């Protein structure tokens, strides 16, 4: 039942133990719990939110313990809310950890905390709701702001319910046939004006799936929207918070004719095929496949309408999900972004590194847009999406293709 002795951070370090931040990831990432309050987690703290526990089976927890290298008798020091700390203690006890304490001086020295360099780009429901009601909040939009739901095709679930004051974007407004690449600068200019977006409008996007919203977001960043943000974990986090919803067709938007800069203002954020091919086989650059493992080895193309199978030869595997519509390797059990530390280590093992020119691709770019926005928020400075992805690559039977099981070395 009970906790071992309380440890300070210093003692925990001396004893080669680990700290476990048991708050929701939003706060682990950098969001203050009160205005002006401590921002981020203790050095090398892990994040195991108590709110995830009901969606972690016994084996998911065991896996997570192993994966963070918690040795069974090495000290673990927990911090956060009491109920949360206690829920995690119970679970870790049942999983067989033997030295569980509280981190006594947790969050007591703000100057030593670590944060997602741009945590403010991944918002959470309560922040968004506070902003809407006119409450002073951390990282407040500098000027106008808009909330937009992004999904494939005309409004459906949006008609049933959506975040109050949210506009709606059909992803067909930003990408189109033949390659499912983004539409033209000129079509983008009109799309932006129509939804009342200028270069200095803060745009907060969410979707029923994070990647639809991310796709829109990366495209707006390319175009020239300076401040584009995602709801971390998407719509489901809003629904689950039991916050207010509105209903019915999207209300009329007041057009903004003049964007205020020439589009595109950030063209380096999107690569074509030749540019993508240029990144291969380099220490200072990575072309990253955000495709499932069966796509990566050539069991399946991932899509009904893509006949060719295999992968871009020399693409480094950035992980993804179980299939072409899932992103488990980037998600906590509640659907929010896994920790920066974990993502950084997963990518590192494949020689994908923040000092490189790094471009993400997948089938047609949605999954890659998602990892792009994470990497942006992790503070990766040279990131982009290779729009065409496997669909464009495998159009040309001259492009080199890899199949078969292979590891990190095989993409030098
Ligand atoms: Na594409």
UniProtKB/Swiss-Prot annotation:
Please name the PROSITE patterns in this protein's record. PROKAR_LIPOPROTEIN, RHODANESE_1, RHODANESE_2, RHODANESE_3
List where in the cell it is found: Periplasm
User: tRNA processing: present as a keyword of the record?
Assistant: no
Q: What is its main location?
A: periplasm
User: What keywords is this UniProt entry annotated with?
Assistant: Periplasm, Repeat, Signal, Transferase
Query: What Gene Ontology terms describe where this protein resides (cellular component)?
Result: periplasmic space
| Impact upon substituting residue 362 to A | Loss of activity
Against InterPro entries, the record matches this protein to: Rhodanese-like_dom, Rhodanese-like_dom_sf, Thiosulphate_STrfase_CS, TST/MPST-like
Cross-referenced SUPFAM superfamilies: Rhodanese/Cell cycle control phosphatase (SSF52821)
Looking at the record, the residues that make up the Rhodanese domain are 13-115, 141-247, 281-402
Q: Which reaction does it catalyse?
A: thiosulfate + hydrogen cyanide = thiocyanate + sulfite + 2 H(+)
Which positions are catalytic residues?
362
Matches recorded under Pfam families: Rhodanese
Q: GO: which molecular function terms?
A: sulfurtransferase activity; thiosulfate-cyanide sulfurtransferase activity
Q: Give its E.C. classification number.
A: 2.8.1.1
Q: What else is known?
A: In vitro, YnjE can be efficiently persulfurated by the cysteine desulfurase IscS.
Q: What is this protein called?
A: Thiosulfate sulfurtransferase YnjE
Q: Which organism is it from?
A: Escherichia coli (strain K12)
């Amino acid at each position: 039942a009970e906790l071992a002795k309380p440890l300070t951070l210093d003692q925990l370090q001396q004893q080669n133990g680990k700290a476990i931040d048991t708050r929701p990831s939003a706060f682990y990432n950098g969001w203050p719990q009160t205005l002006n309050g401590p921002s981020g987690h203790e050095l090398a703290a892990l994040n195991l939110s108590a709110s995830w526990l009901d969606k972690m089976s016994t084996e998911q927890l065991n896996a997570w313990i192993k994966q963070h290298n918690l040795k069974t008798d090495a000290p673990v020091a927990l911090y956060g809310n009491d109920k949360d700390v206690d829920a995690v203690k119970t679970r870790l006890q049942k999983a067989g950890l033997t030295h569980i304490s509280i981190l006594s001086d947790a969050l007591s020295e703000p100057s030593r905390l670590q944060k997602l360099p741009h945590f403010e780009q991944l918002v959470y429901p309560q922040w968004l709701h506070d902003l809407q009601q006119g409450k002073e909040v951390t990282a407040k939009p500098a000027g106008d702001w808009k909330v937009i739901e992004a999904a494939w095709g005309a409004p459906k679930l949006y008609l049933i319910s959506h975040i109050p004051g949210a506009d709606y974007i059909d992803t067909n407004e930003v990408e189109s046939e033949p390659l499912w690449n983004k539409v033209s600068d000129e079509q983008l200019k009109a799309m932006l004006a129509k939804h009342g977006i200028r270069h200095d409008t803060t745009v907060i996007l969410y979707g029923r799936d994070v990647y639809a919203a991310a796709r829109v977001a990366q495209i707006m960043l390319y175009a020239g929207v300076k401040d584009v943000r995602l709801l971390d974990g998407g719509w489901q986090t809003w629904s689950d918070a039991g916050l207010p919803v509105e209903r019915g067709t999207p209300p009329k938007v007041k057009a903004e004719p003049d964007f205020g800069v020439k589009i595109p203002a950030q063209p380096q954020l999107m690569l074509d095929m030749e540019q993508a091919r240029g990144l291969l086989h380099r220490q200072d650059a990575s072309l990253v496949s955000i495709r499932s493992w069966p796509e990566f080895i050539g069991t399946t193309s991932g899509y009904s309408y893509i006949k060719p199978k295999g992968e871009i030869a020399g693409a480094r595997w950035g992980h993804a999900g179980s299939d072409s519509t899932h992103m488990e390797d980037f998600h906590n059990p509640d659907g929010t972004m896994r920790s920066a530390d974990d993502i950084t280590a997963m990518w590192k093992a494949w020689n994908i590194k923040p000092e490189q020119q790094v471009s993400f691709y997948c089938g047609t770019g949605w999954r890659a847009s998602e990892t792009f926005m994470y990497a942006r928020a992790m503070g990766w400075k040279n990131v982009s999406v290779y729009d065409g992805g496997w669909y464009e690559w495998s159009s040309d039977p001259k492009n080199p293709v890899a199949t078969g099981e292979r590891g990190p070395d095989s993409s030098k």
